[PDB]
Structure 1
Amino acid sequence: EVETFAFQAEIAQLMSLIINTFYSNKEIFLRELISNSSDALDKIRYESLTDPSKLDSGKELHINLIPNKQDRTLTIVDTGIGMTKADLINNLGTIAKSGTKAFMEALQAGADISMIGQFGVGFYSAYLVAEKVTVITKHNDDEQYAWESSAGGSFTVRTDTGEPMGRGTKVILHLKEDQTEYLEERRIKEIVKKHSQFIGYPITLFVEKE
């Protein structure tokens, strides 16, 4: 049912640096997640050129931002290419094809955490604002999976069946008590306008029911 894995040592070290480094400019987390979504959307768009059946799991190419003050979550949804189980475990749990090593060296030599996206590890900036991250994903060649981690060196993967998404990735950010500014409509719009105004897919900010 639930499988537990260790992060590769360098990934756990990087996460600990993000959790533990004093750094006020936390808002860049949202840019880095939107940018991974946009990348995943380019890839499905590209594939569907030579095989239009890749869109049978959904034609719309977009990014949805879903704040929920009651649950204290901000969720980033995209309809990009998604990840298989193996891709999820490698992509989130190992250095894989990222510049994890170069980033940690860079911060020692004067880079700052705002530059994390240059090294293909921008995802982990989620831990600037979230105590826990859940990544739900569905690739055309696999079943739906949920990855989850509150850091501390491990993560879990299980199958996810309540709510099939079609195709793509949802990142759910269980925000820290002091990071609820990122559920405010005004704050979200400001950050999207500041850092993500050129993304080439519709970004829809959901309104809250209460």
Structure 2
Amino acid sequence: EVETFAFQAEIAQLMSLIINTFYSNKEIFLRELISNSSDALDKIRYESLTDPSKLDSGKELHINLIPNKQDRTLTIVDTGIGMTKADLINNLGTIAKSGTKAFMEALQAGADISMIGQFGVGFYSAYLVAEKVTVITKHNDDEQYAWESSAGGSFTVRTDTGEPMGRGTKVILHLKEDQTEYLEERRIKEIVKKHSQFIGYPITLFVE
């Protein structure tokens, strides 16, 4: 059973801005997603200090970047804390509401799209390069979910009956036709070195 939801108006407006604005420095999407993964990993690590059973879903704390030319996807995988159904449907959108407003105000004040991460909505920079984003996530004490959106004001959530992940988040970027450079090893390696050099977790770039 697939449920369809409308984004909050402000989020839909943000996504359209991201999709519509002429902005060539698209590569910043990768720094934002890795930064989200790092935050998610910081969260599970912190929580495991007071409750060590939280690592029973997996002890290794890392980030994998997986390009697939056959499927035209770049997947960012982490073993961070994961997201609950409420995160996916309600909670994150509520945080995203005030961030969006500030960001859209800052852009009019002369800021640029690369600063999106300072407003807590960097996940949406995925839409710089992806026609569709699929997010597979698994939080302790909740089921595994698949969230999906090709923008246009709506997203879906289903209970994921695919392959179990243990704990964490996979962001699958279905790349736009003209954005397949982000499937190239040299290109990803360049970007990670330029913007994500000091992340406190191993980042493995998979090869094809």
Q: Offset of 1:90 from its aligned partner?
A: 2.3
Does residue 142 (structure 1) correspond to residue 168 (structure 2)? The answer is no
Q: Unpaired segments of 5 or more residues in structure 1?
A: none
Asked whether the equivalents of residues 6 and 93 of structure 1 are also in contact (C-alpha less than 8 Å), the reply is: no
Deviations 1:141-185 (A, max 9, x none): 200000000000000000111200000000000000000000000
Distance 1:94 1:156, change over 3 A: farther
Count of equivalent residues: 208
Deviations 1:79-103 (A, max 9, x none): 0000110111125544457511100
Asked whether the equivalents of residues 148 and 155 of structure 1 are also in contact (C-alpha less than 8 Å), the reply is: yes
Asked whether the equivalents of residues 84 and 139 of structure 1 are also in contact (C-alpha less than 8 Å), the reply is: yes
CA distance in 1, matches of 2:119, 2:43: 19
Equivalence for 1:81: 81
Distance 1:148 1:94, change over 3 A: farther
Asked whether the equivalents of residues 10 and 97 of structure 2 are also in contact (C-alpha less than 8 Å), the reply is: no
Asked whether the equivalents of residues 90 and 96 of structure 1 are also in contact (C-alpha less than 8 Å), the reply is: no
Distance 1:180 1:91, change over 3 A: farther
CA distance in 1, matches of 2:203, 2:194: 14
Deviations 1:29-74 (A, max 9, x none): 0000000000000000000011110000000000000000010000
CA distance in 1, matches of 2:47, 2:98: 22
Deviations 1:105-160 (A, max 9, x none): 11111000000000000000000000000011000020000000000000000011
3-state SS, counterpart of residue 49 of structure 2: helix
Taking the TM superposition and a 5 Å limit, the aligned residue runs for 1:96-115 are 96=96, 99-115=99-115
Asked whether the equivalents of residues 32 and 117 of structure 1 are also in contact (C-alpha less than 8 Å), the reply is: yes
Q: Unpaired segments of 5 or more residues in structure 2?
A: none
Distance 1:98 1:144, change over 3 A: farther
3-state SS, counterpart of residue 26 of structure 1: coil
Q: TM-score, normalised by structure 2?
A: 0.97
CA distance in 2, matches of 1:90, 1:114: 26
CA distance in 2, matches of 1:11, 1:59: 34
Identical-pair percentage: 100
CA distance in 2, matches of 1:148, 1:100: 20
Taking the TM superposition and a 5 Å limit, the aligned residue runs for 1:26-175 are 26-96=26-96, 99-175=99-175
